[PDB]
Design a protein around this ligand. Structure first.
Ligand SMILES: *[C@@H]1O[C@H](CO[C@@H]2O[C@@H](C)[C@@H](O)[C@@H](O)[C@@H]2O)[C@@H](O[C@@H]2O[C@H](CO)[C@@H](O)[C@H](O)[C@H]2NC(C)=O)[C@H](O)[C@H]1NC(C)=O
Ligand SMILES: *[C@@H]1O[C@H](CO)[C@@H](O)[C@H](O)[C@H]1NC(C)=O
Ligand SMILES: *[C@@H]1O[C@H](CO)[C@@H](O)[C@H](O)[C@H]1NC(C)=O
Ligand SMILES: *[C@@H]1O[C@H](CO)[C@@H](O)[C@H](O)[C@H]1NC(C)=O
Ligand SMILES: *[C@@H]1O[C@H](CO)[C@@H](O)[C@H](O)[C@H]1NC(C)=O
Ligand SMILES: N[C@@H](Cn1ccc(=O)c(O)c1)C(=O)O
Ligand SMILES: [Zn+2]
Ligand SMILES: [Zn+2]
Ligand SMILES: [Zn+2]
Length: 446
């Protein structure tokens, strides 16, 4: 979403989000750090290819051709510099000149020392309560973004972790068609299409980086949850990790865990989809969670089996037509969970990543809310670990990731909504250890 210095009347009217870095001659003198060698303001590269006919409302939705409905000028950073104003480094690099390589290791949450488990839980809690130093979130769509008097940008500060929740919400929300009109819901810029794995990869990378700067710990890494154990239970739902079941309410988190104190954002869909507003930073109810608790649906009362992971890593084409939730023999769709681990599509199956979500029977099972439950982080670093092993094994074969006719948001060169600066799926479609400064300490079934 947008840097606070671009969430201004001047910046939105200009269409330029190219903030200063260290201006020593007055405002606008070091845009993108162009005084040093760090970058320059330039025109936005956005995808103009066609999308699937599934979305019929071209011209109605601020997320189309991201980010041109807000800005047509951005920073492009030189070399291994990065960031909204080219003041930081690309993933895997540090130092004033972005020339010292780092490689952080993402580990199984269960393998961490007692002090590392407690350090991770507290870091997450700190992110829930700490204002994001860079990004603010829109509470209204572009037509109303400048406020009633036209001079009051409709943005709020938001914590580090709630920003992580908000961008996921924004990527899946419905297209508002107007008061009286029913919002359009056959659209999802981060699921049910090829961009699912690259989108969620950046999502994790952005939270990880934000927590490193919040902690001043360059090497801090996000753990993962191996949910492919075939278990009846959630083995990370203990009070030293993520929280156990409350004994006073089967659907709440134990009061002995800090997560029972969390209050969710973005749980007012009926307001957003009838008044055309957006999720803001005001929190509401508690996390609801009830592992295996969906008696109405026995298929989602057990977690994937270890053999589900091995099977899906044998699917060698990243994605297949129609590049949607009903694709067959698509690794993307298999690991996402709409096909079975062998690639066979079945409207009645949920497996792997989808199954782990549904197994929570709660806040984590609803796509517009699920990052509110911090299991989401661990569930998706695991999905990313699977994705990374695929990248290794099939040599990052981006060839079946379609350039056009995907569901909207999912063309290969689409800028992943709503990340800032603009970042394509392509930039994420690389093996992490050589290209993104992280790797997984994990071994696969065989
Ligand atoms: C690049 O953007 C400028 C600024 O326009 C804004 O960009 C988007 C947020 C979009 O929502 C526009 O409505 C915003 O106005 C464009 O310059 C303006 O263009 C509009 C009509 O397009 C015109 O009425 C204004 O007079 C222009 N204002 C200024 C300060 O020039 C510019 O045309 C865009 N260039 C592109 C898209 O190639
Ligand atoms: C954002 O937070 C700043 C402090 O970082 C505070 O001064 C202000 O209330 C907020 N500004 C906007 C535009 O939301
Ligand atoms: C934030 O969202 C809630 C729920 O829709 C809403 O009632 C409230 O008015 C919103 N706040 C702002 C400032 O729009
Ligand atoms: C949880 O499962 C029950 C049935 O056992 C179902 O009625 C309810 O909708 C589910 N809730 C969520 C959030 O999945
Ligand atoms: C997948 O779903 C779309 C939209 O419902 C449909 O047009 C397409 O034919 C489906 N493909 C299948 C079921 O193979
Ligand atoms: N919608 C999916 C389940 N699901 C729920 C929450 C999510 O975040 C997600 O990514 C997927 C399904 O129908 O199986
Ligand atoms: Zn350039
Ligand atoms: Zn998701
Ligand atoms: Zn998910």
């Amino acid at each position: 979403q947008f840097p606070r210095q671009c969430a201004t009347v001047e910046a939105l009217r200009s269409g330029m989000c190219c903030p200063d870095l260290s201006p020593v001659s007055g405002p606008g003198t070091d845009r993108c750090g162009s005084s040093s060698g760090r970058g320059r303001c330039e025109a936005v590269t956005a995808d103009s290819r066609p999308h699937s006919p599934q979305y019929p409302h071209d011209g109605r939705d601020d997320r189309e051709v991201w980010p041109l409905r807000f800005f047509n000028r951005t920073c492009h950073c030189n070399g291994n510099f990065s960031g909204h104003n080219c003041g930081t480094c690309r993933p895997g690099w540090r130092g004033a000149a972005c020339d010292q390589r780092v490689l952080i290791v993402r580990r199984n949450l269960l393998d961490l020392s007692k002090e590392e488990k407690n350090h991770f839980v507290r870091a997450l809690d700190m992110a829930k309560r700490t204002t994001h130093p860079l990004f603010v979130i829109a509470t209204r769509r572009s037509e109303e973004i400048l406020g009633p008097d036209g001079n009051t940008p409709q943005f709020e500060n938001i914590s580090i972790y709630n920003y992580f929740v908000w961008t996921h919400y924004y990527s899946v929300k419905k297209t508002f068609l107007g008061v009286g009109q029913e919002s359009f819901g056959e659209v999802d810029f981060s699921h049910e299409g090829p961009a699912f794995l690259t989108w969620h990869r950046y999502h994790l990378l952005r939270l990880e980086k934000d927590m490193q700067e919040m902690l001043q710990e360059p090497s801090f890494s996000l753990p993962y949850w191996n949910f492919a154990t075939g278990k009846n239970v959630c083995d990370i739902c203990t009070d030293d990790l993520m929280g156990s079941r409350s004994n006073f309410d089967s659907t709440l988190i134990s009061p002995n865990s800090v997560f029972s104190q969390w209050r969710v954002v973005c749980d007012s869909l009926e307001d957003y989809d009838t008044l055309g507003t957006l999720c803001n930073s005001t929190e509401d109810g508690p996390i609801r969670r009830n592992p295996a608790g969906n008696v109405a649906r026995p298929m989602v009362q057990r977690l994937p089996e270890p053999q589900d992971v091995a099977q899906c890593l044998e699917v060698g084409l990243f994605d297949t037509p129609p590049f949607y939730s009903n694709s067959t023999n698509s690794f993307r769709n298999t690991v996402e969970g709409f096909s079975d681990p062998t690639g066979k599509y079945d409207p009645a199956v949920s497996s792997l990543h989808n199954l782990a979500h549904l197994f929570l029977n709660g806040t984590g099972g609803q796509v517009h809310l699920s990052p509110n439950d911090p299991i989401f982080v661990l569930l998706h670093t695991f999905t990313d670990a699977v994705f990374d092993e695929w990248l290794r094994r099939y040599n990052a074969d981006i060839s079946t990731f379609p350039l056009e006719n995907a569901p909207i948001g999912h063309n290969r060169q689409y800028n992943m909504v709503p990340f800032w600066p603009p970042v394509t799926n392509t930039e994420m479609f690389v093996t992490a250890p050589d290209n993104l400064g992280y790797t997984y300490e994990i071994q696969w079934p065989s």
